[PDB]
Amino acid sequence: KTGRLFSGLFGLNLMFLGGTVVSSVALSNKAVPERDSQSFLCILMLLSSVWALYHLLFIRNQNGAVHHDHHAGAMWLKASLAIFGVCSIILSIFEIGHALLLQNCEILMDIVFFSIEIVFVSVQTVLLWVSCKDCVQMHHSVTRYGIMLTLATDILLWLTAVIDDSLEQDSMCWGLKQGYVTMFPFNIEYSLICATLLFIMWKNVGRREXXXXXXXXXXXXXXXXXXXXXXXXXXXXXXXXXXXXXXXXXXXXXXXXXXXXXXXXXXXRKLDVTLLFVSAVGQLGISYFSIIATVVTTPWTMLSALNFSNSLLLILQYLSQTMFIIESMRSIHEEEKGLSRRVVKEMAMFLMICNIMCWILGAFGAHPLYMNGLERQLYGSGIWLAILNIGLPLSVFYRMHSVGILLEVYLHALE
Amino acid sequence: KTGRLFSGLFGLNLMFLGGTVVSSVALSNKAVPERDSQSFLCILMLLSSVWALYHLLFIRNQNGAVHHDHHAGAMWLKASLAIFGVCSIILSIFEIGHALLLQNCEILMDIVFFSIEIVFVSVQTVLLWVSCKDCVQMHHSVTRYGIMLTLATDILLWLTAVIDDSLEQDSMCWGLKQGYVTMFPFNIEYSLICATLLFIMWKNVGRREXXXXXXXXXXXXXXXXXXXXXXXXXXXXXXXXXXXXXXXXXXXXXXXXXXXXXXXXXXXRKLDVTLLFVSAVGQLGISYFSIIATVVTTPWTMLSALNFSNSLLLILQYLSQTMFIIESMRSIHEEEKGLSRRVVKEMAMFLMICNIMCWILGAFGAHPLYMNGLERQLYGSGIWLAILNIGLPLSVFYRMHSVGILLEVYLHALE
């Protein structure tokens, strides 16, 4: 415990000293240059990678790393790491080609920068796939320092990717860049998954006592290229269809979990429940901003109320699905010490399909808020784009975390 | 527990719907007017007050409110509520006189606004003094709704006070206003104390099983008027003396707790430890912003390094004092199941004096960052002033929370 605090304050101080540098570039833009946020990030990343090799080769293979058979983080948290990691590779690959085939500008600073991120992701997703379930017993003092070095590295990468001035508006430059970067950012989503995996490992250090993997990263490159197919195939009726797909999918979902919560009344792990509540920003903060943004517009179009009906319906699906999960999760833990079970079984099976239908349209779909333009006229586009890059990766992470709890109550009902 | 979640999601949704309104005024400033942040706040406040009377008269006086004798929040958390509450009254009293004795402008919207805040504070500090230690058993469903209504009311008051455009720069208008509002804001500090008192009560609802008070609010009005005496008595040598007082007080404090942490090595409640870590922003976020802000200035004055030495010394007093508290707090909890004790006793006695010396200079002292002007030239003054109103009330709350733990280890050492 004493080594945990001696690692904790080093872990707390480092991200504050890191997050100061990457923010002060954005607050001033004139005195401090753009290279010091990046140079510091690269140096921090290099040392985090060589620890991961040192933990892999010379530490884990020795005797004294106790396996955690029981829960230790499940398959989807490993799988969504594997999917969202390799899409961040291609997004850096498509970036680094643009830097080469470019007008006469700065050379080799960003090119040496993005190449290290290709190294840093690739060695980290290997580590977290292997060391997801380990409980280290041999060298406590270096591993507790080694994790918080990597944990502080990701949060700065999350903070650097949020505050990004996309100053928008040549036969090969335009088609490679303009229809491309209007996507769901993947390196942000990769940063949250490595954040929520390193913390469970850091909590569980010093605790007393291949044909099914190659299909994930193979088909994801077709799914990542499917995202580019949507933006390169471009309306007031197409976006009306784009808002129709999210409306028609979640329509029965509000009617589903409402009856499901009532059956838990007629019938009568600790880190999981907070991860459901931090995700409230992705479905309440981004929506209430838009509901106000349709009300105080003057003309009241026939699709402004379509935008208002979308964001209001997003709130009700949140508050129905959340209470269904926790009332089910209490209904399993108490069973340590009927046809209503058929109601719970038929309900969780329906929710798992629509959440996946929401997730693929969420991540590998259109970025629907640059197409929106209503609140982009109301709020400033330089600061409204920051609110998208906080909530939209949180909302997608809300789905992949919720599906795994729904699979647990489905399996518990059928057995 | 089920009524707790049914109160929790109502409590979570309300502050997001509230915090959306008060922020969207600040992001646009043109479509939404200034009155709707305020009108909504006033309506929310009125309903929170009449619950507090209803809990006071008709609920607590009935049988079935179990006293918590043991800890339940101690005297200083009640006392700092009593001090910082009544200074918020005079700050609203001095505001409402300026609104009357004023140029021809808007009438009676702000005047009806600030009068309700005089009501809302005064009925709340009566309630939290009385109901600090109660564990309600009679009407669970209304009290869990009643607390989260008041808890969401304070956080919007914390958020409204942060985002405030002080567009600075008549024989009775100037001396009443200009030397006055450059103070440590008290209504922000009042909001945090009511936040950390309502949450312990909300956690402890439904748990199974006057001559020493009049001196606080009496002498605080002399101390609040002592704050106005400093700004109305006004240099490059005076601010050099102002930075000298903070330097000379915390100088031995870094040398104190360093030797104190070593004696805990030579010798060999759960909500308290997180409140020590949220307070890191008040002593690390505001300092690292300034250390960069002295480095990238060109001329390197003979007092720029004085400003750099101040903020660097603030970090080392944080990391010395924090590990001393937790290593002492573990050293008391383990004693359920020597002259080194004289080292701990002489150390905690010295720290309690300098923290109080830091606190009075912290709260009832000069606001040293409007006098600073260095980073006000580097960062924008419209957004640097927001960072002061996050960290400076957190840093003052860090002191009053730390003193009470130091009094506990001092009493435990002497007995």
What does DSSP say about strands A134-136 and B134-136: parallel, antiparallel, or unpaired?
A: unpaired
How close does chain A come to B334, measured CA to CA in Å? Answer: 13
Residues of B in contact with A20 (CB under 8 A): 285, 288-289, 292
* Joined tokens for residue A198: 């390193």
Cα A351 from Cα A249, distance rounded (Å): 11
Q: Is B312 exposed, middle or buried (0-12, 13-18, 19+ CB in 10 A)?
A: middle
Please report the number of interchain residue pairs, chain A to chain B, with beta-carbon separation below 8 angstroms.
Answer: 78
Residue B173 neighbours by CB distance under 10 Å? 12
B288/A16 touch (CB, cutoff 8 Å), yes or no? yes
Q: Is A342 exposed, middle or buried (0-12, 13-18, 19+ CB in 10 A)?
A: exposed
> Helix B286-295 vs helix B304-333: angle between axes, to the nearest 10 degrees?
150
* Joined tokens for residue B193: 């104390």
How close does chain A come to B285, measured CA to CA in Å? Answer: 7
User: CA distances (Å), B92 to each of A382, A406, B103, B115, B229, in order?
Assistant: 36, 52, 19, 8, 18
Residues of A in contact with B383 (CB under 8 A): 27
**B137 contact partners, CB below 8 Å, separation of at least 6:** B64, B65, B66, B206
A21/B292 touch (CB, cutoff 8 Å), yes or no? yes
* Joined tokens for residue A196: 């929520």
Report whether B134 contacts B66 (CB < 8 A). Answer: yes
Residues of A in contact with B326 (CB under 8 A): 5
Q: What is the 3-state secondary structure (H, E, C) of chain A?
A: CHHHHHHHHHHHHHHHHHHHHHHHHHHHCCCCCCHHHHHHHHHHHHHHHHHHHHHHHHHHCCCCEEECCCCCCCHHHHHHHHHHHHHHHHHHHHHHHHHHCCCCCCCCHHHHHHHHHHHHHHHHHHHHHHCCCEEECCCHHHHHHHHHHHHHHHHHHHHHHHCCCCCCCCCCHHHHHCCCCCCCCHHHHHHHHHHHHHHHHHHCCCCCCCCCCHHHHHHHHHHHHHHHHHHCCCCCCHHHHHHHHHHHHHHHHHHHHHHHHHHHHHCCCCCHHHHHHHCCHHHHHHHHHHHHHHHCCCCCCCCHHHHHHHHHHHHHHHHHHHHHHHHHHHHHHHHHCCCHHHHHHHHHHHHHHHHHHHHHHHHCCCCCCCCCCCHHHHCCHHHHHHHHHHHHHHHHHHHHHHHHHHHHHHHHHHC
Rg (CA), chain A: 23
Note whether A172 contacts B: Cβ–Cβ < 8 A: no
A31/B327 touch (CB, cutoff 8 Å), yes or no? no
Selecting from A6, A9, A17 the residue whose C-beta is nearest the C-beta of B288 gives A17
B27/A319 touch (CB, cutoff 8 Å), yes or no? no
What does DSSP say about strands B65-67 and A134-136: parallel, antiparallel, or unpaired?
A: unpaired
User: CA distances (Å), B30 to each of A172, A377, B27, B37, B145, in order?
Assistant: 41, 12, 9, 13, 35
Residues of A in contact with B32 (CB under 8 A): 292, 296
B285/A20 touch (CB, cutoff 8 Å), yes or no? yes
Report whether A250 contacts A314 (CB < 8 A). Answer: yes
Q: What is the 3-state secondary structure (H, E, C) of A217-280?
A: HHHHHHHHHHHHHHHCCCCCCHHHHHHHHHHHHHHHHHHHHHHHHHHHHHCCCCCHHHHHHHCC
Cα B261 from Cα A61, distance rounded (Å): 36
B16/A326 touch (CB, cutoff 8 Å), yes or no? no
What's the gap between Cα A63 and its chain centre? Answer: 34
Resolution to one decimal, Å:
3.9
Selecting from A5, A330, A383 the residue whose C-beta is nearest the C-beta of B323 gives A5
- For chain B, the structural domain boundaries read 2-231, 238-414
Of the candidates B355, B90, B96, B119, the one whose C-alpha atom is nearest the C-alpha of residue B224 is B90
Q: Is A288 exposed, middle or buried (0-12, 13-18, 19+ CB in 10 A)?
A: buried
> Which of A13, A267, A274 should we substitute to test contact with B (largest number of B Cβ atoms within 10 Å)?
A13
How were these coordinates obtained? cryo-EM
Cα B227 from Cα B179, distance rounded (Å): 10
* Joined tokens for residue A79: 């799988």
A326-365 residues touching B, CB cutoff 8 A? 326-327, 330
Of the candidates A161, A144, A157, A160, the one whose C-alpha atom is nearest the C-alpha of residue A198 is A144
How close does chain A come to B29, measured CA to CA in Å? Answer: 9
A32/B292 touch (CB, cutoff 8 Å), yes or no? yes
Residue A134, strand partner residues: A67
Note whether A308 contacts B: Cβ–Cβ < 8 A: no
Cα A369 from Cα B247, distance rounded (Å): 50
B24/A289 touch (CB, cutoff 8 Å), yes or no? yes
A380/B27 touch (CB, cutoff 8 Å), yes or no? yes
Residue A222 one-letter amino acid:
X
Q: Is B349 exposed, middle or buried (0-12, 13-18, 19+ CB in 10 A)?
A: middle
Count of CA atoms in the C-beta half-sphere (13 A) of B160: 23
Selecting from A1, A16, A379 the residue whose C-beta is nearest the C-beta of B284 gives A16
Buried b (16+ CB within 10 A) or exposed e, B88-112: bbebbeebbeebeeeeeeeeeebee
Cα A392 from Cα B165, distance rounded (Å): 30
Report whether B200 contacts B73 (CB < 8 A). Answer: yes
Note whether A34 contacts B: Cβ–Cβ < 8 A: no
Token pair 């269904």 is found at A324
Residues of A in contact with B16 (CB under 8 A): 280, 284-285, 288
Residue A197 one-letter amino acid:
L
Measure the CA angle with vertex B219, ends B213 and B220; round to 5°.
95
Cα B40 from Cα B220, distance rounded (Å): 31
A28/B280 touch (CB, cutoff 8 Å), yes or no? no
**A329 contact partners, CB below 8 Å, separation of at least 6:** A272, A273, A405, A409
**B156 contact partners, CB below 8 Å, separation of at least 6:** B15, B18, B19, B22, B41, B44
Note whether B378 contacts A: Cβ–Cβ < 8 A: yes
Selecting from A9, A326, A379 the residue whose C-beta is nearest the C-beta of B323 gives A9
Residues of B in contact with A326 (CB under 8 A): 5
* Joined tokens for residue A292: 């106000």
Residues of B in contact with A277 (CB under 8 A): 12
Residues of B in contact with A31 (CB under 8 A): 296-297, 378
Of the candidates A162, A146, A131, A147, the one whose C-alpha atom is nearest the C-alpha of residue A26 is A162
Count of CA atoms in the C-beta half-sphere (13 A) of A73: 25
Residues of B in contact with A315 (CB under 8 A): 13
